Structures are given as structure tokens and as C-alpha cells.
Amino acid sequence: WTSVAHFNRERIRRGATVDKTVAKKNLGRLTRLWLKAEQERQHNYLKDGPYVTADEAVAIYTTFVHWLESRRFQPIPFPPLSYKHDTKLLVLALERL
Amino acid sequence: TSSRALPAHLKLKYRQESQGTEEEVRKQDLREALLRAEAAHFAT
Amino acid sequence: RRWDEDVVFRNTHKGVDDTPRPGFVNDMLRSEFHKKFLARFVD
Amino acid sequence: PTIDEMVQEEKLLNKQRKYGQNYEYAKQIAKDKTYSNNLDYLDENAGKLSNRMKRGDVSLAQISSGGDLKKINHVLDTCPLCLNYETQPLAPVISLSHRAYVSLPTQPELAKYHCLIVPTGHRINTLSCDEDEWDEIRNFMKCIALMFDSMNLGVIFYENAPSPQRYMHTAIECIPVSKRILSLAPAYFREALSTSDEEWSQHRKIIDTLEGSKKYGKWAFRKMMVKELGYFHVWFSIDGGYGHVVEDEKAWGRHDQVPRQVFASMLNLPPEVIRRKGSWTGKKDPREDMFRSRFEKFDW
Amino acid sequence: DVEINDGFAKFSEALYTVERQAREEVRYRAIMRQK
Amino acid sequence: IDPSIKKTEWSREEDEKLLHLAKLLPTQWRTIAPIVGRTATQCLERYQKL
Amino acid sequence: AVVLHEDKQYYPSAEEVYGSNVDIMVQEQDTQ
Amino acid sequence: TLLNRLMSLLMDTNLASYASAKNNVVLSYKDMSHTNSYGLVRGLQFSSFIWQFYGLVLDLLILGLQRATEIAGPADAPNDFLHFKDQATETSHPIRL
RNA sequence: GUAUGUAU
RNA sequence: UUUAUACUAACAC
Numbered sequence: 041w042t043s044v045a046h047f048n049r050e051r052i053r054r055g056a057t058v059d060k061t062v063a064k065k066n067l068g069r070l071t072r073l074w075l076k077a078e079q080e081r082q083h084n085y086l087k088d089g090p091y092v093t094a095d096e097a098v099a100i101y102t103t104f105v106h107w108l109e110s111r112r113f114q115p116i117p118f119p120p121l122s123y124k125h126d127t128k129l130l131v132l133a134l135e136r137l
Numbered sequence: 138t139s140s141r142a143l144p145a146h147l148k149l150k151y152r153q154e155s156q157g158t159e160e161e162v163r164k165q166d167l168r169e170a171l172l173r174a175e176a177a178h179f180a181t
Numbered sequence: 182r183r184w185d186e187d188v189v190f191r192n193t194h195k196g197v198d199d200t201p202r203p204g205f206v207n208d209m210l211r212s213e214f215h216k217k218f219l220a221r222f223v224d
Numbered sequence: 225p226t227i228d229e230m231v232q233e234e235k236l237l238n239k240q241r242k243y244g245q246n247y248e249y250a251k252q253i254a255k256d257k258t259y260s261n262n263l264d265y266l267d268e269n270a271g272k273l274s275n276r277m278k279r280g281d282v283s284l285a286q287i288s289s290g291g292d293l294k295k296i297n298h299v300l301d302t303c304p305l306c307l308n309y310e311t312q313p314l315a316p317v318i319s320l321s322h323r324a325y326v327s328l329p330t331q332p333e334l335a336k337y338h339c340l341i342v343p344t345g346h347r348i349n350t351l352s353c354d355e356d357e358w359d360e361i362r363n364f365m366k367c368i369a370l371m372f373d374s375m376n377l378g379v380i381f382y383e384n385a386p387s388p389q390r391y392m393h394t395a396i397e398c399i400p401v402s403k404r405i406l407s408l409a410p411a412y413f414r415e416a417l418s419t420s421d422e423e424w425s426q427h428r429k430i431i432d433t434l435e436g437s438k439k440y441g442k443w444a445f446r447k448m449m450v451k452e453l454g455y456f457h458v459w460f461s462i463d464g465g466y467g468h469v470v471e472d473e474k475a476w477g478r479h480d481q482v483p484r485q486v487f488a489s490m491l492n493l494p495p496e497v498i499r500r501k502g503s504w505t506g507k508k509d510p511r512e513d514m515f516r517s518r519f520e521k522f523d524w
Numbered sequence: 525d526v527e528i529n530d531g532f533a534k535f536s537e538a539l540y541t542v543e544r545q546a547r548e549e550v551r552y553r554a555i556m557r558q559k
Numbered sequence: 560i561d562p563s564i565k566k567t568e569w570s571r572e573e574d575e576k577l578l579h580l581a582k583l584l585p586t587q588w589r590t591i592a593p594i595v596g597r598t599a600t601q602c603l604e605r606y607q608k609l
Numbered sequence: 610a611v612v613l614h615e616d617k618q619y620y621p622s623a624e625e626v627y628g629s630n631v632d633i634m635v636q637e638q639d640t641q
Numbered sequence: 642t643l644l645n646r647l648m649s650l651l652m653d654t655n656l657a658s659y660a661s662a663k664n665n666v667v668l669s670y671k672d673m674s675h676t677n678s679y680g681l682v683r684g685l686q687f688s689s690f691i692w693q694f695y696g697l698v699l700d701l702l703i704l705g706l707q708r709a710t711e712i713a714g715p716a717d718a719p720n721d722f723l724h725f726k727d728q729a730t731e732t733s734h735p736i737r738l
Numbered sequence: 739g740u741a742u743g744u745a746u
Numbered sequence: 747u748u749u750a751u752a753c754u755a756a757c758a759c
């Protein structure tokens with residue numbers, strides 16, 4: 041059952057097959073075969089613990105701080121209750137939906 | 138009866154004298170050709 | 182060699198070689214083949 | 225049977241737009257139960273799929289009313305304007321013509337002297353109106369324009385009827401806009417109309433009555449545009465205009481916006497005015513009274 | 525029944541100190557820049 | 560609704576470790592739930608809000 | 610110390626299960 | 642976790658909580674599902690913004706702070722898409738653009 | 739109201 | 747005469 045989802049994803053990559061049935065089935069069989077292995081990549085991240093290692097994260101954070109420091113960067117606040125732009129912003133959001 | 142059940146390959150192909158006749162296997166000493174082949178593969 | 186002095190990280194990918202690619206596995210879902218097959222046909 | 229008898233059958237259908245040879249074909253498939261959609265099968269049946277025209281009847285009673293009884297009457301019973309002896313409209317109304325009138329719009333409001341012409345009869349598409357009824361609309365157009373000419377302004381009017389299946393009244397609305405902003409509008413719309421709808425349509429976006437009026441000023445719109453199907457139309461002066469016919473109305477805008485969004489940009493208003501909601505109700509004096517006294521000087 | 529490894533705890537609290545320390549470094553910088 | 564959920568009761572000494580993971584992860588509330596055992600992340604968020 | 614998920618090899622070498630005087634032949638591709 | 646901290650810089654601490662939380666989620670398809678602790682999910686309306694600023698990090702480990710400030714130039718008046726102020730700064734490094 | 743079977 | 751259900755449905759919008 042795994043074998044086949046290999047063999048038919050490489051008669052589609054190529055071109056040979058058609059009719060949804062096969063491009064429908066061997067899209068399912070993948071979607072499982074992939075969820076199976078996005079499950080393990082999670083479980084075997086809490087069991088094997090963070091891969092970053094604090095020392096690496098410390099550098100990455102601190103170096104990032106110096107970059108924002110260099111810019112004279114102002115952090116983005118929480119939307120004021122009297123904000124002229126929000127009505128405009130909302131409409132855009134819906135128009136996108 | 139069908140298409141597939143028509144005359145085809147009316148001739149068999151018996152083993153010619155060089156490619157592996159059953160008589161040549163008797164005179165062959167399988168035993169020694171086996172061991173010698175293993176040694177060669179192993180050494181490499 | 183002052184450009185390589187500024188890098189906040191160092192030889193990270195230093196021992197990157199070998200891997201179990203030689204080792205055959207009787208588990209179609211956890212071979213290397215399959216890790217490449219899902220590597221490619223997604224994202 | 226019989227040819228003189230058969231001619232009568234053909235003209236009767238011609239008035240009933242809902243039922244023709246497409247409904248007998250579409251009915252036969254639902255009725256057939258066993259129907260495989262191929263070319264092998266559609267030939268093996270062939271005659272069985274076309275055969276019908278026995279159940280069709282009704283004659284005059286069907287055509288006189290039109291568009292069903294239950295549907296149009298439900299529209300007519302609710303219709304918030306339609307001026308009769310029996311029914312009085314929800315709009316306050318300013319000046320009454322014999323077959324038309326001016327009245328004030330909904331509460332959101334696009335401009336301070338925003339109005340709308342409305343025919344008395346249930347007309348839908350303003351192309352379906354009688355040439356007798358259209359002449360009253362023209363006298364309204366000139367007097368309304370001349371009212372805003374003293375104000376130094378000018379006006380753009382329009383009407384939007386993307387769906388006549390719904391069977392709604394058509395309100396030709398007047399929008400007071402300054403002359404320098406008026407001269408830009410020919411651009412704005414020309415962009416909006418070509419952009420709005422999908423551009424594989426047959427009808428071709430934009431149909432200028434402004435050039436057609438030089439050929440026939442009395443009626444360019446009425447000659448060029450067609451009544452039966454959808455449509456939208458703007459105009460400048462008495463008989464100028466840009467014209468686009470609407471297809472895929474779901475894409476266009478069910479609540480009126482494609483035009484209102486253009487005026488929301490051209491005139492420039494907040495994004496809360498863009499959508500028109502509310503009702504006419506009645507007895508809204510303080511806003512509609514200021515228009516009547518001003519209008520009466522220029523109004524026949 | 526599943527549990528997190530001890531390294532996770534290490535990682536969390538390691539970052540708290542960086543955010544605390546850096547915040548003071550910013551206030552040190554901000555005070556210096558006022559002169 | 561299901562039986563596996565633990566609706567009733569919350570035992571103090573078992574609970575001082577449930578607010579401990581919030582120090583570790585910060586948000587991440589669905590990975591906390593199978594550890595904390597009480598599940599129904601809603602309540603696991605509301606309990607730390609008490 | 611940290612074995613990144615990419616490496617995390619779950620099973621043991623084909624050798625160390627016999628790993629001495631036995632021949633471990635991995636044969637995917639054909640010859641001839 | 643790292644994202645939560647990095648995020649906390651760019652904006653108010655309350656907003657950044659949303660984003661980080663938003664990413665955890667349960668993923669579902671037919672018979673099966675699982676939690677999403679490790680990965681970053683794109684479905685979110687703002688998952689662009691997350692990936693661009695966290696991509697920013699992955700540039701500031703290649704470039705280095707020194708070079709990066711030269712490319713972008715002053716924060717008061719940054720350089721063009723592919724231009725500099727001086728020829729000296731342009732030639733200082735092997736990495737031009 | 740047939741596709742498909744039961745009775746005379 | 748009223749209310750509900752199904753069958754009329756080989757109906758109609």
C-alpha cells in the first residue's frame with residue numbers, strides 16, 4: 041500500500057495516468073503517508089527535546105536585539121480604541137475573505 | 138474459442154550442447170567450482 | 182580574514198557526512214528512500 | 225398539426241420567455257431517471273429526449289400577467305414605492321409627474337442634495353418604459369441640472385439593474401458633484417466598468433452614448449442599449465453617457481457597490497458610507513424639506 | 525503516558541535571563557544616550 | 560461529554576506542577592494537556608487564569 | 610548530545626546484529 | 642518557544658501571545674489528527690509576516706551585523722534595492738549584493 | 739413509474 | 747368544518 045503510492049506518484053510526475061480516480065486515490069494515500077510522518081516529527085521532538093540548544097538561541101536572540109537596537113526601532117503597540125485607520129483596515133480584511 | 142487460444146510457439150527449445158545439457162552436468166564437478174567461486178568473491 | 186571573524190556562529194556543519202544510507206532497513210516507512218520521496222513530492 | 229394552426233403555437237411561446245425548447249430538453253433528463261451522459265447513449269435515445277410539448281398550455285392567462293403570479297404579486301404587495309390610488313409610497317416625494325416622481329434616498333446618503341427619479345409603474349429596466357413616460361424624465365433632468373448650475377456644480381446620474389429576474393423597481397439617482405471632479409469621472413467609470421466584470425464577455429465593456437448622441441441626441445441610449453438582459457448606465461449632461469451590460473451579477477454586486485465605490489472614491493468619503501443600508505419608512509421632514517423649497521424655483 | 529525531557533526546562537529559563545539581561549543593557553544604553 | 564474527561568475536582572498538590580509547564584512553554588497549550596492529564600485545554604487555560 | 614530528527618536512527622547497524630564473519634550484501638540495482 | 646521570544650520584541654507582549662498560541666493547533670484529516678507544537682503553520686492570515694521577520698534572522702547569521710548595516714545603510718535614509726553610498730563600503734567585502 | 743422482477 | 751401524516755408527483759416555480 042505504500043509501495044503503490046510511490047509507483048503512482050511517478051506515473052503522474054511523468055504524465056501517463058489520468059481519470060481522477062487514480063489522481064484522487066494516490067493523493068489520499070500520500071496525505072496519510074505524510075501525516076504519519078508529521079506525527080513522528082512532533083512526538084520525536086518532545087521526546088528528543090529542543091534541537092536549538094540555549095547557547096545557540098542566546099546568540100540568535102542577542103544578535104537580533106542589536107539589529108533592532110541599531111535601527112532605533114519602535115515596537116508595534118496594541119490597537120488604540122480611538123484609531124483612525126482601523127475601519128479602513130477591517131474592510132480590507134473582509135474584501136480578502 | 139478465443140484469440141489467445143490460437144496456435145502459437147508450436148516448437149519447444151531443448152538444451153543445446155554448450156549452454157547446459159544435463160549430461161555435461163554429470164561430468165561437471167559442481168563441488169569444486171562452487172568453492173573456487175566463493176574464494177574469488179571473498180578475496181576481492 | 183576579518184569577514185570570517187564577524188560571523189556569530191562557526192563550524193556548525195563540520196562533521197556532516199556518512200549517514201545510515203548504506204544500512205538497509207526492513208521498514209518501508211522509515212527508510213531513506215521514503216524520506217526522499219516525501220521530501221520531494223511535498224512543499 | 226396543420227400549418228395555420230402551428231403558426232399560432234409559435235407566437236404564443238415567443239411571449240413566454242421562461243418555457244421554450246430548452247426546458248423540455250432539461251425536463252426530459254430529470255424525468256428519464258435512467259440517463260447515462262455519453263454520445264453512444266444520447267444517440268440511442270435521440271428521439272426520446274426531444275419528445276414533449278403535450279403538457280404545455282394556458283394560452284392568454286399565462287402571458288397577461290407574466291413572471292408568475294405568486295412572485296410578482298409578492299413583490300408588488302411589498303414594493304415600498306409604486307404610486308397608485310390604493311397604495312401610497314414609503315418615500316416622502318417632492319414633485320410628481322404623471323408617470324414619475326422625485327424623492328429622497330435612504331439614510332446613509334451619498335451627498336447633501338442626493339435624489340432619485342422613480343417611475344410610477346413597475347418598470348424595472350428604464351428601457352422598458354414608454355416613450356411618453358421618458359419625456360417627463362428629461363424635463364426633470366434639465367431642471368435638476370439647472371438647479372445645480374446656479375450652485376456651480378453639475379450632476380452625474382445613473383441606474384443599476386444587473387438582475388431583472390428579481391423584478392425590482394429602477395431608481396435613476398442624481399449625484400451632485402463639482403465640475404472639475406465631474407470632468408474626471410469619464411476616466412474613473414471607464415476603469416471600473418472594464419475592470420469589475422470578467423473580460424471574456426461577448427458584449428464588450430463600455431458603450432458610449434456620448435458619441436452616439438452626436439449621431440442621434442434625442443435617443444442614443446434607447447437605440448443602442450438593450451432592455452431584456454441585465455445592464456448598467458451612467459450619463460453626463462442631458463443625453464451623454466457611458467454604458468456597460470452586466471454578466472455574472474454575483475461578481476458585480478448584489479447590494480449596489482460597483483458604482484457607489486466609484487463615487488466613494490471620486491468624491492472621497494469614509495469606508496462606512498460605502499454600503500447602503502436602512503429604509504424609507506416615512507415622515508422624514510428635516511432633511512427632505514430643505515430640498516423641496518430649493519427645488520421649487522427651478523422645478524416645473 | 526508521555527513526558528518532556530529535562531533539556532526543555534533548561535532552554536526556557538535560559539531565554540528568560542537573556543531577556544532580563546538585554547533589557548538592562550538597553551536601559552544602560554538609553555541612560556548613556558541622554559548625556 | 561466523554562468518560563475520559565475529568566470534570567470533577569482539582570487536587571492542589573497535583574496542580575502546582577500544572578502551572579509549572581506554563582513557565583517552560585508559554586502558550587503552547589495543546590502540548591501541555593496530555594502531560595497535565597486533566598485535558599480540556601479550555602479549563603487548563605482557565606485554571607492558570609485563576 | 611542532541612540528535613537532530615534527521616539523524617535519529619532508530620534501529621541498529623546490520624553488522625552488530627551479526628557483525629563479524631557474515632557477509633552483509635545490499636543489492637538494489639541489477640547488473641547485466 | 643524561540644518564536645514567542647523573538648516575536649515579543651517586534652510588538653506588544655499581548656499580540657505576540659496570539660500568534661505563538663495560534664500556531665500550536667490540532668491538525669485534522671479524516672480518521673486521524675495530531676497536535677502541532679514543533680512546526681510553523683502557514684494557513685494563518687498573518688503567516689506571511691511571521692515568515693518574513695523570522696527569515697530576517699536567517700539573513701543576519703549569514704551576512705553578519707557589520708555588512709548588513711552597510712547594505713541597508715542608515716535607517717534614517719536606507720539605500721536603493723541594489724545601491725550603496727560609497728565605493729569604499731561597496732568594495733569592503735566579497736559579498737556585494 | 740421506468741430500470742427490474744411476481745401473478746393470469 | 748378543523749389539525750397531523752403518507753400517498754397521490756408519472757406537477758410547477
Ligand SMILES: [Zn+2]
Pocket residue numbers: 303304305306345346393
Ligand atoms: Zn414599485
